Enzyme design. Structure first.
Site, PDB file in Angstrom:
ATOM      1  N   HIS A 199      -0.399   1.980   3.203  1.00 23.00           N
ATOM      2  CA  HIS A 199      -1.335   2.498   2.205  1.00 23.00           C
ATOM      3  C   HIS A 199      -2.762   2.184   2.648  1.00 23.00           C
ATOM      4  CE1 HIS A 199      -3.323   2.512  -1.907  1.00 23.00           C
ATOM      5  NE2 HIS A 199      -2.753   3.701  -1.840  1.00 23.00           N
ATOM      6  N   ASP A 223      -1.228   7.394  -2.442  1.00 23.43           N
ATOM      7  CA  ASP A 223      -0.718   6.646  -3.559  1.00 23.43           C
ATOM      8  C   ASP A 223       0.768   6.806  -3.837  1.00 23.43           C
ATOM      9  OD1 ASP A 223      -3.275   5.820  -3.733  1.00 23.43           O
ATOM     10  OD2 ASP A 223      -3.611   6.489  -5.804  1.00 23.43           O
TER      11      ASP A 223
END
Length: 122
Positions: free
Chosen positions: A47, A89
């Site tokens: 991420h 996300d």
């Protein structure tokens, strides 16, 4: 927006970003570095790597459109940045859900000084 991602994290893990993910291993939360502590930590790593690719987007502020039917996260239309961020996300939100089976409490609030390893490449 970090509040949305935090929403996803909760919707996928039934857990809450803070504390459970605010700081974990060496990549969850505020950037980080070294080598991923484990599966979940690997998720934050990727991420972190994701946002990085988007140098021109306020990854933490920009709000995006997303949905959540039958646990599947949809990213609506928007801007490269908004769409991109959404896409970073959900893969994480899901990555965390796929690792729940090995979440390590001990890694929660895991000091970054202990992250004495050669930073992993993206």
């Amino acid at each position: 927006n970090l509040l949305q991602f935090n929403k996803m994290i909760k919707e996928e893990t039934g857990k809450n970003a803070i504390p459970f993910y605010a700081f974990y291993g060496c990549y969850c939360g505020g950037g980080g570095n070294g080598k991923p502590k484990d599966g979940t930590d690997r998720c934050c790593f990727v991420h972190d790597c994701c946002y990085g690719r988007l140098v021109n987007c306020n990854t933490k502020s920009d709000i995006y459109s997303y949905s959540l039917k039958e646990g599947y996260i949809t990213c609506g239309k928007g801007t490269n940045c908004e769409e991109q961020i959404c896409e970073c996300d959900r893969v994480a939100a899901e990555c965390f859900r796929r690792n729940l089976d090995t979440y390590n409490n001990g890694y929660m609030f895991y000091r970054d000084s202990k992250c004495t390893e050669t930073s992993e490449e993206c």
